[PDB]
Ligand binder design. Structure first.
Ligand SMILES: *[C@@H]1O[C@H](CO)[C@@H](O[C@@H]2O[C@H](CO)[C@@H](O)[C@H](O)[C@H]2NC(C)=O)[C@H](O)[C@H]1NC(C)=O
Ligand SMILES: *[C@@H]1O[C@H](CO)[C@@H](O[C@@H]2O[C@H](CO)[C@@H](O)[C@H](O)[C@H]2NC(C)=O)[C@H](O)[C@H]1NC(C)=O
Ligand SMILES: *[C@@H]1O[C@H](CO)[C@@H](O[C@@H]2O[C@H](CO)[C@@H](O)[C@H](O)[C@H]2NC(C)=O)[C@H](O)[C@H]1NC(C)=O
Ligand SMILES: *[C@@H]1O[C@H](CO)[C@@H](O[C@@H]2O[C@H](CO)[C@@H](O)[C@H](O)[C@H]2NC(C)=O)[C@H](O)[C@H]1NC(C)=O
Ligand SMILES: *[C@@H]1O[C@H](CO)[C@@H](O[C@@H]2O[C@H](CO)[C@@H](O)[C@H](O)[C@H]2NC(C)=O)[C@H](O)[C@H]1NC(C)=O
Ligand code: NAG
Lengths: 106, 170, 50
């Protein structure tokens, strides 16, 4: 409706008997393949991304936002737990870091 | 073919030019309408040969290789169910090319979700895409993943009911 | 010639692979929409009869 791509903003310009809209949009570029999984199995629990997606570059698993590659460590702060690992099709085994663990470890 | 009639008709001026111009404007407007509706992608996307979409069946909407018209069963049913100086101009886009445009749109929305509509087509597994759509309507991803077989069965049943309803209603 | 719809682009679909963008383009596009016409008035008596 407001240009090709994800619409950011628009600017109006007057024209003879008309209007010209300059649509400023965000276009994704330089995409890269990653291996993806619906959920992460850890401690018999299924973890799902709170806002992003699980991606793998070949050896390590990360969670990133869907529209830009920004890999982050899979923690309990960016994932949520729902059920065990027996139900979700395609769940893979990976560790889930706990930020509170070094606090009581020290 | 009457010369006397044309000589008398010339007394009325450029009425004929106005009518021809209006009809020409309508005729080009129809082609513009078809371009606006169907030609919204400049890439002709194709489905993978293996139809592994996590239980989701799209055979009733994807083009049938057995048919010479390369139409879907639903599109084939739709085409079957629709039945002195005058000329009929053919449309600029033929039915097979319009079907090809719809096939490209279907392949893009199945293999890439909404990414192809906003830029480059980014591949995503179809259950994950459905989970994204679930999050769009405010339902968590887990609900989709846990009940994936049920959702796929319901979707296939609904698509079959659509074909049956179109085939059974005049 | 017979017109070509678009370049063929077979998307590499598989059940466990995703494509994530690593960059972006800020794209500005133009959309021209007519708003008004020339306001024309015709005196019917003066046009037909002078
Ligand atoms: C995937 O990304 C991870 C993290 O960026 C990579 O792990 C790093 O690899 C470099 C190269 O040897 C090491 O120096 C770092 O110490 C690693 N980080 C960690 C936390 O172990 C991983 O190698 C990448 N895999 C591929 C196939 O590119
Ligand atoms: C992921 O981890 C689970 C649990 O640790 C694995 O499930 C086990 O698989 C072995 C071998 O088939 C069985 O003997 C165990 O009884 C299973 N445990 C449970 C709780 O189901 C699973 O195989 C692992 N998957 C991968 C790919 O490593
Ligand atoms: C997807 O749905 C189609 C249509 O419902 C299935 O095709 C049917 O397959 C059965 C079993 O071989 C046949 O008896 C039917 O006549 C077929 N119907 C049609 C319209 O061809 C198809 O098997 C389903 N699954 C897949 C993986 O494509
Ligand atoms: C992601 O991986 C797929 C699979 O290898 C790539 O798809 C192939 O790309 C090559 C390079 O042009 C083509 O010759 C093949 O025909 C493609 N295969 C299919 C099935 O389309 C894809 O290009 C990769 N994507 C990125 C961004 O690297
Ligand atoms: C993302 O893409 C932009 C282009 O839109 C890249 O910016 C260019 O980087 C090259 C390499 O240094 C420069 O020669 C160009 O002049 C840059 N263009 C502009 C407009 O600044 C950017 O580097 C890319 N980033 C990544 C991480 O790929
Ligand atoms: C993807 O399909 C392959 C076989 O084609 C299967 O072995 C694998 O488990 C599937 N993965 C998922 C996540 O469905």
């Amino acid at each position: 409706f407001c240009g090709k791509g994800y619409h950011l903003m628009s600017f109006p310009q007057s024209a003879p008997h008309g209007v010209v809209f300059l649509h400023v949009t965000y276009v994704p570029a330089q995409e890269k393949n990653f291996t993806t999984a619906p959920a992460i199995c850890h401690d018999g629990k299924a973890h799902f991304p709170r806002e992003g997606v699980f991606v793998s570059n070949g050896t390590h698993w990360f969670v990133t936002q869907r529209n830009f590659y920004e890999p982050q460590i899979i923690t309990t702060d960016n994932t949520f737990v729902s059920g065990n690992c027996d139900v979700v099709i395609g769940i893979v085994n990976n560790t889930v870091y706990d930020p509170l663990q070094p606090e009581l470890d020290s | 073919d009457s010369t006397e009639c044309s000589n008398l008709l010339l007394q009325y001026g450029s009425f004929c030019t106005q009518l021809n111009r209006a009809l020409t404007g309508i005729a080009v407007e129809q082609d513009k309408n078809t371009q606006e509706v169907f030609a919204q992608v400049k890439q002709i996307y194709k489905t993978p040969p293996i139809k592994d979409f996590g239980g989701f069946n799209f055979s009733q909407i994807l083009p049938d290789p057995s048919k010479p018209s390369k139409r879907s069963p639903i599109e084939d049913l739709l085409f079957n169910k629709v039945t002195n100086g005058l000329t009929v101009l053919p449309p600029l886009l033929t039915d097979e090319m319009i079907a090809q445009y719809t096939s490209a749109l279907l392949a893009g929305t199945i293999t890439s979700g909404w990414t192809f509509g906003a830029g480059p087509a980014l591949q995503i597994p179809f259950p994950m895409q459905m989970a994204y759509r679930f999050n769009g309507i405010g339902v968590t991803q887990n609900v989709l993943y846990e009940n994936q077989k049920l959702i796929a069965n319901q979707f296939n049943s609904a698509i079959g009911k659509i074909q049956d309803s179109l085939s059974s209603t005049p | 010639y017979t017109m070509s719809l678009g370049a063929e682009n077979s998307v590499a679909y598989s059940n466990n692979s995703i494509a994530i963008p690593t960059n972006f383009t800020i794209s500005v596009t133009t959309e021209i929409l007519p708003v008004s016409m020339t306001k024309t008035s015709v005196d019917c008596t003066m046009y037909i009869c002078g």
